[PDB]
Amino acid sequence: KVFGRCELAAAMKRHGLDNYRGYSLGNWVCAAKFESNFNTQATNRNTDGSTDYGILQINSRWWCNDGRTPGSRNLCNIPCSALLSSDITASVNCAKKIVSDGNGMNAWVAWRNRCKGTDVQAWIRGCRL
Length: 129
Ligand SMILES: [Pt+2]
Ligand SMILES: [Pt+2]
Hints:
InterPro entries: Glyco_hydro_22, Glyco_hydro_22_CS, Glyco_hydro_22_lys, Lysozyme-like_dom_sf. This protein is mainly α. It has 4 helices and 3 strands.
């Protein structure tokens, strides 16, 4: 599923991402935009053989099990395929784990490069939330 900007903001806000670990909702929408272009089915293979999954491009080396990333961990205790569902519950819960891990949203490179320091509030401007 490809979310509408405001639609995703609302879903994220209902799943408790609004100001989670001090990151306002705009940050998470911005990150999703540049990680996946709001597409829940987005996948990307990394040069190290790991793969990134879903709206938030969560990596199989650490966070999910895809059964072909050797030596990896599965810190969220889920199959990576769960992260491609249209229901974003799995992704959100895993992201909360990730962001609490100590690097905050810097874990997400697109956030760091493209959202950090910007007017992220623009991303939720004119939404009914
Ligand atoms: Pt939901
Ligand atoms: Pt939830």
